[PDB]
Amino acid sequence: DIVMNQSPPSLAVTPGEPASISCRASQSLLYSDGHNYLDWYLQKPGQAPQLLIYLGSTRASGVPDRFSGSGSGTDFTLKISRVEAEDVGVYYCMQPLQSYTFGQGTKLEIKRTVAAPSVFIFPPSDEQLKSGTASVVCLLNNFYPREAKVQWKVDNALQSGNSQESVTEQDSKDSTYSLSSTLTLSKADYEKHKVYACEVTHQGLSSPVTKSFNR
Amino acid sequence: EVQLVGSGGGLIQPGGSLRLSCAASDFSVSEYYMTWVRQAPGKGLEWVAVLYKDGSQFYAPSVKGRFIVSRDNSKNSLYLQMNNLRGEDTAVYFCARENADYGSDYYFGMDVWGQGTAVAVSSASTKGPSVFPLAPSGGTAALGCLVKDYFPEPVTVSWNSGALTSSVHTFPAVLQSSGLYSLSSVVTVPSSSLGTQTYICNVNHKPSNTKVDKKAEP
């Protein structure tokens, strides 16, 4: 019955600046073995966990040099000597001694330079209409940081409550995010109007841009 | 490649059972502690059960009594029997090799994992998706695939059966008020190589046997 506690819950790092993640245990992870039974697993977006460190400080097969694992007794630290874009994901500590308990996971994020989003818009399908509903989609394909304001305007009059947005996990190469807003209404209400606009605000823009399309 | 391939997730009413398996590659499942770790939607990792080399198991509190880990050497496969399932069990399940042996000494970490197998404990009936094209701007131009109104999670989507990997974004699905999920998959593509190419999205939603392809012409 060991409890893992792990901090920080999340982490923003400039590419090539170090990163620390800490795991402290409710009780000692040392052993008769003279070994510390703690591992570090990292789970990239969409992947299964992958083994990084084990027995406290033994880097594992095919794991880059910049990861190290250190610590002893009740206190351990996974240390990235210089973080790269590939490293982005959730990190978990675990002790197997009794009885396979995980940390809560330091999510790791990459401090990228600002990047405005390429913005796209997509009108309802042929067949989605030929079935009586209309979803309008708005792509913000690559941008940084995450915080992006997608304002939907129908006939240049505001919309609020009928559309949901989804946000990609930080890219593994360019450290980008992406977002897919979907304006959803009947057709019926769709064919009540003409002008359909996506308006996007972001840290990296001069003016909120507006790609759009009319009925 | 030493590797674990998982099979058979699904949807089940509570109280129901379900069997998961993993098929091992380049190592004998008989030669290792084999282990199951699950991940709830939005949550972290949770160890669920171990298979020792000698056939005896060890189970986590949340699960003792209802689950059994077994292996079949002849099929070099690992199994987890999931009985009297409840909503709390709804998760992605990972089989993994525990490269260890406390009969001898050395521990080498949990170094091989299955891709994760999803289990939906729910009373709703499986709702399959509908796949809508998303046809097209700069020097490059985007296109995608809308997949809408399905239960339960998840869905499999690719571009031309694995072919188109780069500049793809399959988005987290959103939970509509209707009860059903909707998700969008889109791919950034050079406007240069315009519609003179055949861009097919490949949607697969296992809980109903539904597998679709789709050109996305403008």
For chain B, the domains span 1-123, 124-218
Contacts B136 to A, Cβ<8 Å: 120
Of residues A37, A48, A103, nearest to B114 (C-beta)? A48
Q: B122-126 long-range contacts, Cβ below 8 Å, gap at least 24? A: B122/B11, B122/B12, B122/B13, B122/B14, B122/B87, B122/B90, B122/B151, B122/B152, B123/B13, B123/B14, B124/B11, B124/B151, B124/B152, B124/B179, B125/B151, B126/B11, B126/B151, B126/B152, B126/B207, B126/B208
Would you kindly state where each structural domain of chain A is located, as residue ranges? 1-111, 112-215
Work out the minimum CA distance from B93 to partner chain A, whole angstroms.
Answer: 10
Q: Which residue has the tokens 């020792």?
A: B52
Contacts B156 to A, Cβ<8 Å: none
Instruction: Give the closest residue to B171 by CA, choosing from A174, A134, A74, A46.
Output: A46
Work out the minimum CA distance from B47 to partner chain A, whole angstroms.
Answer: 6
Give CATH for domain B1-123.
Answer: 2.60.40.10
As given in the structure block, the two tokens for residue B168 are 């793809």
Query: What residue of A is the nearest CA neighbor of B108?
Result: A54
Judge contact between B202 and B159, C-beta under 8 A: yes
Mutation for testing the B interface, residue in A100, A104, A106 having most B CBs under 10 Å = A100
B124-218 is classed CATH 1.10.10.10 = no
* CATH domain A1-111 topology: Immunoglobulin-like (2.60.40)
Cα distance between residue A23 and residue A151, in whole Å: 41
DSSP code of A117? P
Contacts A42 to B, Cβ<8 Å: none
Cα distance between residue B116 and residue B122, in whole Å: 19
CB contact under 8 A, B58 and A102: no
Cα distance between residue A29 and residue A82, in whole Å: 27
Of residues A104, A139, A179, nearest to B44 (C-beta)? A104
CB contact under 8 A, A167 and B172: yes
Cα distance between residue A101 and residue A27, in whole Å: 12
Work out the minimum CA distance from B112 to partner chain A, whole angstroms.
Answer: 8
As given in the structure block, the two tokens for residue A166 are 């989804």
Which superfamily does A112-215 belong to? Immunoglobulins (2.60.40.10)
Window A:163-192, CB contacts with B under 8 Å:
164-168, 178-180, 182, 184
Burial A114-149 (b: 16+ CB within 10 A, else e): ebbbbbbbbbbbeebbeeebbbbbbbbbbbbbbebe
As given in the structure block, the two tokens for residue A102 are 């995980």
| Helix and strand totals (H; E) in chain B | 0, 19
For the beta sheet containing B67-72, the strands, ordered from the edge strand earlier in sequence to the opposite edge, are B3-7, B18-25, B77-82, B67-72
As given in the structure block, the two tokens for residue B214 are 């789709």
Contacts B47 to A, Cβ<8 Å: 94, 99-102
The total of other beta-carbon atoms located within 10 Å of residue B61's CB is 8
Of residues B44, B109, B114, nearest to A102 (C-beta)? B44
Cα distance between residue A171 and residue A185, in whole Å: 31
Phi, psi (deg, nearest 5) at residue B47: -70, 140
Mutation for testing the A interface, residue in B2, B104, B186 having most A CBs under 10 Å = B186
Query: What residue of A is the nearest CA neighbor of B45?
Result: A102
Judge contact between B209 and B13, C-beta under 8 A: no
Between CA B157 and CA B164, with CA B162 as vertex, the angle to 5 degrees is 95
As given in the structure block, the two tokens for residue A76 are 């351990």
Of residues A60, A137, A142, nearest to B111 (C-beta)? A60
As given in the structure block, the two tokens for residue B133 are 């094209």
- The approach used to solve this structure was X-ray
Mutation for testing the A interface, residue in B1, B46, B63, B110 having most A CBs under 10 Å = B110
Of residues B44, B136, B186, nearest to A105 (C-beta)? B44
Of residues B35, B105, B115, nearest to A48 (C-beta)? B115
CB contact under 8 A, B96 and A92: no
Judge contact between B129 and B149, C-beta under 8 A: yes
Of residues B35, B109, B116, nearest to A54 (C-beta)? B109
H-only helix segments in chain A: 126-129
The total of other beta-carbon atoms located within 10 Å of residue B103's CB is 8
Instruction: Give the closest residue to A111 by CA, choosing from A46, A23, A203.
Output: A203
3-class SS at B208?
coil
